[PDB]
């Protein structure tokens, strides 16, 4: 157990660990939920890039020596490659400004970046956590940064991929099944013939709209709050710095990026630009919000693509069973052989908690108090629990249901034989009051609207064999 | 045309045949947001013209105003309750958060009506003082929420609770119906074991009476009235005992209402107002209104699921489950000529998700306290009175314009109980689990029923099946 | 009291009304909130702008007489210039297709036209609701038109120079007040020095951020469902129909604007193209849900302009009272002489149901049906309501507090004097750790940093007046 | 290194330590969502041991099982919620929405525990079948629903309400030590009218009883639990009085837990454990664990105005209200050297949009049934949980660290008396609210005190205003 000091006075920490007096600290003063909301590792890694070209930029701008900027670099990349997770344990429910999560990153690198210059661990550190790791920076700027920074490349370079891979496999079921007539339901009723591929270019349309989306928005989060400082003046920060820091860190996201994942082009690039106005990117987080938003309407399609192949596959026998759904696992402890939609279980109850999670992010966008909005922590854990939702469960969806979706063809053909509107093709042969007649006669007396149209003489049973055909009802032109 | 009326911040005009004052005239202008559709509830207006009869008599039984005064706001009081003034109140609910221009509205109509009752001519010399007379003894702090409470406790005892035990009365009846019609339960949307039509309907009369018991037992504590808080909740100018008169003289008066509006009727519960045991969080919070918010929020919960369990299970007619045939109320589709909707279903989901958004937006008001007053109040009322309205329509609408008629596809329902694979639940304490499970999927892979498949797989004889495989007997296994 | 039948038999309407039968039955058989609950007129109005521009397109498609069309045509204006209000008396707690309200209005414009082309008013209608006025037209597919159209309007005309309006009175206020010196507030605790106009940018780059968002939405709710008929295969719907309708549709909307405002060019041109994929357009409602959201963002942007306007002009006596709101009426029935920040109280309220209207349309958006989600009249009501709010709210608060915001310039003053996180400019002189000392000084003691840095041999009472300069603080370049 | 296991569907292998089976190795490749931080909530899988106990006490006590087995069980059973085998639990939330996968989960771990305790060694031949033995007489349809309503009501009796109970005993010692401190209140940020630090603190205290008996109140009802119910509620397969012995001998089970984790210590709630009265409602919805949730978005919304008001009241220290002088637990800023930040006030805020959000996800969820089975369950068991581990947990960290050491600037609260113009107020019945108006609008247009301004303007006597105006009578006017 090593002794630390600080304003407040001496406490203890492990002799193993890299934090110090600050982390110490906010251990002991904000034990809500430490064994399951710990803050997330990928705003620590965030503020490690920012630490890394911080230093670059400060040295650059000659505000710091190249002994100590090349240390921090050294350290913040262990960091960013998961070597010091261990040295991360405070939680989402801190101050609201992630102030002790950005001192608990400074702390890391000063006491690490320290080790590196002297060669053994000391009492007095060489590198400073306020003077040199932090130098030019406040919370207020350094933690949207790493907010926006964290939640561009989850975005980016996992929820798009992910969304672009269900969009490709229900592609490949929209072609194989483009030429498969079914019974179209309006309101669960009985309606006209569609193709399953018409069928499934639906939710391929809703997902390439939610995509489209999230590209556009992902340039809007890339602007950064960087160099507004304390209340946004910038105020002990240089001029250029935040121009310079955002031109090194798209130049290390682009090198990450190529690092992470071989013969890829990246969805969308990354390129940060200091923020137009630093007072909104302190007081407010709209273009976060703008993307939870994004994140929102995706998840309301992805509930009807699960609801639709939860409804289309029921049965086997008492049910539509128009969708046969890979059989992944048994479904009851009692009911020996049932096999449930539960890949379609999984998509709607992940989509729900997306949607919470941005009801939760539209209360805490709205919560700006003058110069600072102080629920930063819960935003970045929310639209970053999201990310790692869509990227997850779209991709188990493709995988496990959409991939070997097949079809039970004597069942849809049975359907398209008994719907009823099918007379909708007549209405401008025999008028809409006569096909009217025509249905009502059909269901009374439980026969087929063929035998029923000349059994009330309204059309020849050679004209209605003309007029009334499945397949070109689904592709009328 | 107009009549010139005056304020602490000035003069201002109004037309000639109003009531109404100056602050009135002032809000009017000043709050220009949705004038067309977002009036302030006219129940608000109703409760605090209640509130003024019952505070001018408390006032002259504790020697604070004259009988001439008190005797004459009461009679103006009762004409805006009757219903002869609704044109007297043009204000938002988009206005100062503590309704104050609401309450100065209410005081303006009764101030200028009690003025020309006793002079019996309307003088710009007002008898009646709206401030000094007919708000004695309150602030809009205290009476807004006490108006809140009271408007509420009547919508929710009187409209939504008959309305509610009226669905649940109704399903009733189709419950008993339908005790012994078999049919299949379906769990993950797939073939389960047998139930009674009766024992799926008794699923939502159970939710609506578990609905009813949580807002009956909520009644009482929205009974609790900030009234005698005055500014801040320290009661400053209210005289001690007016908060215990006021609230007796109260419930006294919405129990004569009752028996006025409602013959041959018990109400289904007695409203008896007390004054709140802590006053500042009476007028700093809204925490009982929030509980019965999330009373309609449960409600409408459970209303979701008999809306979409009766519109999945009147699907069809030809392609879908087709166990229910809901009444046909109008012919249905503009281009599909004979296609009928599950309309009554499609209203009562979309009047649910009103409710669950009007619960969301009562939540958000409600965590806004700032020291020592809310000021969302306008929009807290509002949200919870549209739910009232809602709940009390549609639950009667669904009742008698659905469920009453209900019938069911007796043909279709039998077919599933005969087809269903999962019947094999019962062989499991006999062959056990494993080899039940076998079983089932021979039957399923080759297009055979279970009895043939135990018989070809020599699980179990054909006479030791016959006797464990009774649908009636798995509905009901006693 | 008129006689009508249909299919379900023989019912009563009055004999002034020119709707029918299938309205007779809706308003009996939705007996839910009718006082206060009618579907939106703008919904109606919209309906009738596409019931003629489909009546001259089923002419130009030699699909009906100009006999027909020409009355049709006439009638859909009588409508929407609101020459027939009371013809519409049904809720949006109806079918969640909205099929009854566009059979209201095919019933009024069926009539209408029927007794313009008559001269009188017979039982026996020369015009057809369903054969000629609803021709080539399902209310899956005109309904959300309807829902687009209207809304597009509602935003581009209304919407949009509301909120151009308080960003232009907020201009002139960041202007005015540009050099007046103030202090920060970060967690409500003593900041750095700022200026006024900063405070005010902050506000303005917010909202020009939700007008942007906005802008950029409008086109993509321009894609309109018609010509998906039934269930978006295009069945009983003519060969270019959804093309030529949208052409139509986009020089009636261009009229119209400029019939209604004179002298102004549109904020955005609404050009109005069929949906790419008409499943999507039937099944989901994804694109209004996506301006919900920027409505969304709007109003938690609105919600920090109003809080803070309420914060920074508490008081008179007890408060911060750096902000003095115009005095628009009395306060309190109790408080003689108490004037309350009332437009910020109104903004605040109309926020939080703008955020409530957003996650009611988010719950409606998610519970898509298959081929058609039958909740579109509670996603219509709940995004036109909010278009009134945004319009009216938005415009009440510039107008009745911005306009004529004033300061308390001694008080504004009085704080710049008394933060002590001025220390915050000596930081790179005298350290972290020393400047703290200095600020824990001048605590202990109550006195300023000056007599406080002197005290304590820090820092020179001559160099101190050299580096701490208020205005040079808040504008550092 | 690995464990070939069976199941209806075939084989699969699995660590070879591990005491999970074949569909808890299928569920962990088939749900691969967030699998690093979503993990089924262990109270959960404590709850199922509990459960999986008793339901083996009652089976051998109803002759379906030997004692043999029966008593193999139950020793497993300890060691699962004595917490002996934390990492044969790996399953996310996002699984089946039945928790079927989970119930499985638990009953292979059980199952090959007790039958390693009977063969006194690991055969792939299991003595306990996890289906016929541990899960006898049971479904994951009524189990889950079991153990979900049995973690909340242990979390929410033993852990919740203590902390709540906490935090208001904690403001009470506030609420007397500053009971005669004369303040000013403010309404709409407004100067208002006196009243005592104490006053202000009761109304904190008053919300959050009002929280605390709403969910003492609850308690009971969600300890109605749907056991018996079995596939769709029917209790096919269940043998007569299985659940009314089970839920006596699961209130026995508890009641000894209890006085195993808490010495000298009485529970807040005694939980009584009955079968539910409708079992088809326990298994198609949550009604009663959403009036909980309900019940925990009314206590957020009170620790919301709590936090916002004490974060600000302590704003300053010099450009603030700063009435209220917060502990300094740490140094505060990174820039900023000396500034110390209501943190305490942050947290709870953060942990109070969370409940909120929390509350409408369980809503949205518990709004989705679908004919006879909720198949969101694992998301509102998830999202309960989690409210109160934070519910429990920040509201103890704000009562130790923020309220416990809170002191006041007495000397700026005592400047706010004397300079509010608003003690006008107590002159209104004396010469009227308008003469009342006129006064103050003198006094703040010429920066003149209220007793110069009332002489000036000749309304009252120095002498009469030092009789209507102390603000200590003010704030307690009797």
Redesign the interface.
């Known amino acids: 157990l090593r002794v630390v000091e600080?304003?407040?006075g001496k406490i203890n920490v492990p002799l193993e660990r890299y934090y110090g007096a600050?982390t110490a600290?906010?251990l002991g003063?904000?034990?809500?939920?430490?064994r399951?909301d710990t803050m997330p590792l990928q705003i620590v890694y965030s503020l490690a890039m920012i630490k890394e070209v911080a230093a670059c930029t400060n040295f650059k701008l000659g505000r710091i020596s190249s002994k100590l900027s090349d240390a921090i670099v050294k350290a913040c990349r262990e960091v960013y490659h998961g070597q010091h997770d261990n040295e991360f344990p405070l939680v989402?429910?801190?101050?609201?400004?992630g102030?002790?999560t950005?001192?608990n990153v400074?702390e890391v690198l000063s006491s690490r970046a320290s080790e590196l210059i002297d060669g053994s661990r000391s009492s007095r550190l060489t590198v400073?956590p306020?003077?040199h790791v932090?130098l030019g920076?406040?919370?207020?700027d350094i933690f949207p940064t790493a907010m926006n920074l964290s939640i561009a490349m989850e975005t980016a370079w996992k929820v798009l991929p992910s969304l672009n891979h269900l969009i490709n496999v229900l592609k490949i079921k929209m072609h194989e099944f483009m030429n498969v007539i079914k019974?179209?339901?309006?309101?669960?009723?009985?309606?006209?013939?569609?193709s399953v591929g018409?069928?499934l270019?639906?939710?391929?349309?809703?997902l390439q709209?939610?995509v489209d989306?999230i590209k556009?928005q992902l340039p809007?989060i890339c602007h950064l709050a960087v160099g507004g400082?304390?209340?946004?003046?910038?105020?002990?920060?240089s001029?250029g710095f935040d121009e310079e820091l955002c031109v090194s860190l798209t130049q290390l996201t682009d090198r990450l990026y190529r690092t992470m994942y071989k013969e890829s082009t990246p969805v969308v690039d990354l390129i940060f630009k200091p923020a137009?106005?630093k007072?909104?990117a302190?007081?407010?987080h709209?273009?976060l919000?703008?993307l939870?938003?994004?994140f929102?309407?995706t998840?309301?399609?992805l509930?009807?693509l699960s609801?639709?192949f939860?409804?289309?596959?029921?049965?086997?026998?008492?049910?539509?069973s128009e969708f046969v759904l890979p059989?992944?696992?048994?479904?009851?402890?009692?009911?020996?052989?049932?096999?449930?939609?539960?890949?379609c279980?999984?998509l709607?109850?992940?989509?729900?908690?997306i949607?919470?999670?941005?009801?939760?992010t539209?209360?805490?966008?709205?919560?700006?108090?003058?110069?600072?909005?102080?629920?930063k922590?819960?935003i970045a854990a929310?639209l970053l629990?999201t990310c790692?939702?869509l990227t997850?469960?779209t991709?188990?969806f493709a995988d496990?249901c959409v991939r070997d979706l097949q079809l039970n063809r004597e069942k849809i053909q049975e359907?398209v034989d008994?719907?009823?509107?099918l007379?909708?093709?007549l209405?401008?042969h025999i008028?809409?009051?006569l096909?009217?007649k025509?249905?009502?006669h059909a269901?009374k007396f439980k026969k087929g609207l063929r035998e029923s149209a000349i059994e009330l003489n309204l059309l020849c049973g050679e004209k209605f064999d003309e007029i009334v055909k499945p397949m070109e009802?689904?592709?009328?032109?």
């Open positions: 600080d304003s407040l600050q600290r906010s003063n904000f034990n809500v939920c430490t399951s989402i429910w801190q101050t609201g400004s102030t002790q950005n001192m400074n400073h306020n003077d932090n920076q406040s919370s207020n019974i179209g339901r309006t309101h669960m009723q009985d309606a006209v013939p569609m018409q069928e270019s639906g939710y391929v349309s809703q709209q939610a989306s556009s809007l400082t304390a209340v946004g003046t910038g105020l002990n920060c001029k137009e106005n007072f909104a302190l007081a407010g709209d273009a919000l703008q939870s938003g994004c929102n309407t998840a309301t399609a509930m009807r609801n639709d939860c409804l289309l596959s029921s049965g086997p026998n008492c049910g539509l059989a992944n696992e048994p479904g009851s402890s009692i009911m020996p052989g049932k096999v449930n939609p539960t890949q279980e999984s709607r109850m992940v989509c729900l908690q949607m919470g999670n941005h009801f939760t539209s209360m805490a966008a709205s919560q700006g108090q003058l110069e600072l909005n102080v629920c922590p819960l929310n629990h790692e939702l997850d469960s991709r188990c496990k359907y008994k719907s009823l509107m007379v909708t093709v209405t401008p008028g809409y009051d096909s009217a025509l249905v009502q269901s009802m689904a592709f009328p032109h």
